[PDB]
Design a protein around this ligand. Structure first.
Ligand code: FES
Lengths: 76, 156, 142, 80, 154
RNA sequence: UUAACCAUUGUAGGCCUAAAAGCAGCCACCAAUAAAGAAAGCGUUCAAGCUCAACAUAAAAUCAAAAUUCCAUAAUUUA
């Protein structure tokens, strides 16, 4: 497999590795839509980071609510 | 009130008789509150108790009655005492198909807090300082108005 | 009854982990491996694949397979075969952001795993979360 | 129970008892238990008819009947 | 001593009796209602406004992942399964374009939200499973039955 | 708080573990979804699997009065 930093950053080594599919080269950054590289790469959105008017905020809050019960349930 | 008629079976909801108009104390959340009857009913008051009891002596659900929990416990105890005292001849238990009662002499009892079946005899009465006390009445009815000089002797 | 296994296509008869477990419900062990071998030929051998076999009470096989795991690939991409004991804080490899997205695009092709979401935020979080499970730190650029 | 027929009219005044009862009939677990049943949502006052091969037919109207009573009556018929 | 025991009883505090017990009190004022749930209002408001006709079919214990696939399946049909908890569905009419659809939205049932008059696509969804009770689609945000939906889905 | 109902998909996630998949150890601890805890008690050749929390849908609101033979009798309301 590829072991070259230049090839790793200039060719899509991990896109396809099968025998029938050959490693395809990386197109220019402008050749892809902006949203491809603009996705959230940071840490998970915390309750502070999460927008109170976003669905993810309450969805993760419900997960946090489940966590509280689980913590209590574990001790029982 | 829903009744089922009977294979094809059909059920009809029928209108129910309404309470007498102009309750003595409107704005009362519970019917006992509405009628100023909080501390003036006893197990002897079968007429009031019968309204909340099934035809065979079963207790009606509290939600249907609408009365508060405190009265529910009091009314339930009062009804149970009346049944044990044989004050509800028309609300006796239902005979399933053809069963008949014990057909043995029935002892007259009243003011019975608990069922006679589950109360064991007190063989050792005790001495003056060790005398055993026998409960009479119900704690749920402590708040009822008393017309005696001193509170009634619950424990005999 | 849905039974999910991640066994590598290279070996179609591991034995205890697949054979008797499916057999306990009552199935033909040989039939399961043969169909698994059929999947093995299409895919590269020795790479874990998630399967979604459904063992109904009627003693039938409903084998469904999808894209190769991104958890093992991230380990391979990081040059790690056996990870650290904990992996919560231990890190042995770093994955560039560009590499992260390239694999995600191919991931969004199966009818299983919910690989039809238009936004790539869902896809990246799963692999980002998977990387956290592994002894790998996903750096934006290295 | 080979067939169960449940209907009600959402546009007109629709009784919840029959609607909730239909959902229980049209349940994956319930359908498996009475596998012989042929379920049909005749939603379109409410009339419910269940047909048996032996010729026993029970017709239930949910306008004055609660969902539980239909379930108890129909469920008892299943044992036969 | 007997006298000492008398003192202990005397220390007992004498409490006054309230006029009426809290349960038997006259109906008193209660804390004002607060919309906690507020986020979900925007989600339902946007989708209902976007989609004129909302086909309705009581969910037959469907699993969550299937809805994701069904969302994509409807995306093939150019429709979306945008549904949300029904506890906040009832206050939808309280704060939304309409206020009279509460009886229609009785119970928790699948909401199929479509903005385009692609009748064939909508029916095909109905062709997947008819056994679940399908109330009908509120064509142009108007109350319709199952048969009414057919009479007006055209 | 505490009464009814249900439980999808990623990832059997990395760890000496043959294998341990929420649930031997061990990890950090994210996603989609309307709602799913990278798991809370169960089950565990390992898993399948039982439920609790999820979502929907119920309905509530500060402690009391050992060996001879039981041992006054009784008793809840007229100021
Ligand atoms: S007398 Fe008013 S609630 Fe009981």
């Amino acid at each position: 497999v590829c072991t070259d930093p230049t090839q790793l950053t200039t060719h899509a080594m991990g896109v396809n590795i099968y025998k029938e599919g050959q490693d395809v080269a990386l197109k220019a950054d402008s050749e892809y839509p902006t949203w491809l590289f603009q996705v959230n790469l940071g840490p998970p959105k915390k309750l502070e980071e999460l927008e109170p008017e976003s669905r993810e905020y309450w969805r993760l809050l419900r997960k946090q609510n489940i966590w509280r019960h689980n913590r209590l349930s574990k001790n029982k | 009130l829903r009744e089922v008629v009977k294979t094809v079976i059909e059920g009809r909801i029928t209108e129910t008789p309404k309470a007498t108009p102009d309750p003595p104390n409107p704005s009362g959340q519970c019917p006992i509150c509405r009628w100023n009857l909080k501390h003036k009913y006893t197990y002897e008051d079968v007429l009031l108790l019968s309204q909340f009891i099934r035809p065979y002596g079963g207790m009606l659900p509290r939600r249907v009655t609408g009365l508060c929990r405190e009265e529910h416990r009091k009314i339930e105890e009062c009804v149970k005492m009346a049944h044990r005292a044989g004050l509800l001849p028309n609300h006796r238990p239902q005979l399933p198909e053809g069963c008949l009662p014990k057909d043995k002499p029935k002892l007259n009892r009243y003011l019975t807090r608990w069922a006679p079946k589950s109360v064991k005899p007190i063989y050792k009465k005790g001495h003056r300082w060790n005398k055993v006390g026998m409960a009479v009445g119900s704690p749920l009815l402590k708040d009822n108005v008393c017309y005696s000089r001193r509170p009634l002797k619950m424990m005999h | 009854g849905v039974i999910r296994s991640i066994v590598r296509a290279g070996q179609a008869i591991p034995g205890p982990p697949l054979g008797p477990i499916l057999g306990q419900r009552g199935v033909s062990i040989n039939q399961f491996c043969k169909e698994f071998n059929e999947k093995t030929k299409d895919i590269k051998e020795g790479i874990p694949l998630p399967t979604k076999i459904f063992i109904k009470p009627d003693r039938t096989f409903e084998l469904k397979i999808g894209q190769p795991t991104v958890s093992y690939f991230l380990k391979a991409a990081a040059g790690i075969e056996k990870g650290a004991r904990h992996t919560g804080k231990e890190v042995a490899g770093l994955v560039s952001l560009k590499h992260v997205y390239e694999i995600a695009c191919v991931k969004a092709k199966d009818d299983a795993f919910a690989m039809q979401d238009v936004p790539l935020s869902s896809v990246v979080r799963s692999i980002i979360g998977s990387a956290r499970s592994l002894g790998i730190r996903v750096v934006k650029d290295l | 129970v080979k067939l169960v027929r449940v209907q009600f009219c959402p546009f007109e005044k629709n009784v919840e008892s029959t609607r909730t009862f239909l959902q229980t009939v049209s349940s994956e677990k319930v359908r498996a238990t009475n596998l012989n049943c042929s379920v049909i949502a005749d939603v379109r006052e409410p009339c419910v008819d269940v047909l048996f091969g032996d010729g026993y037919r029970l017709i239930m109207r949910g306008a004055h009947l609660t969902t539980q009573e239909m379930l108890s009556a129909l469920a008892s018929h299943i044992r036969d | 001593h007997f006298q000492r025991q008398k003192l202990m009883a005397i220390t007992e505090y004498i409490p006054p009796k309230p006029a009426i017990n809290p349960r038997c009190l006259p109906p008193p004022p209660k804390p004002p209602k607060e919309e906690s749930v507020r986020l979900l209002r925007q989600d339902i408001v946007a989708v209902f406004r976007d989609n004129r006709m909302i086909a309705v079919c009581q969910n037959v214990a469907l699993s969550a992942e299937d809805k994701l696939l069904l969302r994509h399946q409807l995306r093939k049909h150019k429709i979306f399964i945008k549904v949300f908890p029904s506890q906040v569905l009832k206050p939808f009419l309280e704060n939304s374009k309409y206020r009279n659809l509460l009886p229609l939205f009785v119970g928790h049932n699948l909401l199929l939200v479509s903005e385009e008059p692609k009748v064939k696509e909508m029916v095909r969804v109905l062709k997947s499973v008819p056994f679940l009770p399908l109330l009908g689609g509120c064509v142009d945000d108007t109350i319709l039955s199952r048969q009414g939906l057919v009479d007006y889905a055209k």
